[model samples]
Target: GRPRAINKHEQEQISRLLEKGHPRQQLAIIFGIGVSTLYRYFPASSI
Candidate 1:
């Protein structure tokens, strides 16, 4: 029930965190999105 297409600002931080060594599901709780939501946007994400 959270926002599917996250705001660009929020999405921007995600990329930084990823390159900054964040886990795949680490930001899931931070962004209020489920695995499906994250996978849809960042299927290849990993630290």
Candidate 2:
């Protein structure tokens, strides 16, 4: 379930961690979203 508003801090944090090689599924766990959803929002995500 996508939220009406996402925390900017969370978004920035996720982006930073991913840029540094953090996996997408792991990030989804940290951010409380599905891996498919994460990839949907960030198509260029490394994992």
Candidate 3:
């Protein structure tokens, strides 16, 4: 089966929401993945 799919737009959008203080858990749900999954996909430079 195919795994959770995501896009660059979503990855970028999260940054905005991160600053917006959006619920971090829903971000994973929105992306059809786990919180760690999003963390894993983010750019290292984003730190």
Candidate 4:
């Protein structure tokens, strides 16, 4: 199944959290995905 819509606002928010040292595991929980999945989705430019 396809994942839900992830708006630019949310993507930016995720990037900010990651910059603030928020772990991938935490991001996964907040975003309803797996840690590995989150890592894969995050582009190098996001960091």
TM-scores vs. true structure, each candidate: 0.66, 0.70, 0.56, 0.66
Q: What tens-digit string does per-residue lDDT give for candidate 4 at 1-47? A: 88654667887888788989988788888877777766666854657
- In order, the Cα lDDT scores of the candidates are 0.71, 0.74, 0.67, 0.75
- How does candidate 1 fare on TM-score? 0.66
lDDT of 3 by residue, 1-42 (tens): 784456668767887776576665787787577877756765
Q: What digit string (tens of lDDT, one per residue) describes model 1 on residues 1-47?
A: 95356778877888677677776587887777776676666667343
Error of 1 at 40 (Å): 1.4
- For this target, which candidate reaches the highest lDDT against the unseen true structure? 4
Runs with alpha carbons beyond 4 Å of true place in candidate 3: 1-5, 42-47
Winner of 1 and 2 under lDDT: 2
Each candidate: RMSD:
3.3, 3.1, 3.3, 2.6
Considering lDDT, where higher is better, how would the candidates rank from best to worst? 4, 2, 1, 3
Worst 10 residues of 1 by lDDT: 38-47
How high is the lDDT of residue 19 in model 1?
Answer: 71
* Candidate 2 TM-score, true structure as reference: 0.70
Cα RMSD for predicted model 3: 3.3
TM-score of structure candidate 4: 0.66
Off by over 4 Å in 4: 43-46
**In model 1, how many backbone clashes occur?**
0
lDDT string, candidate 2, 1-47, tens digits = 85533477877787788888888899888777888877776677344
Lowest-sum lDDT 10-residue window in model 3: 38-47
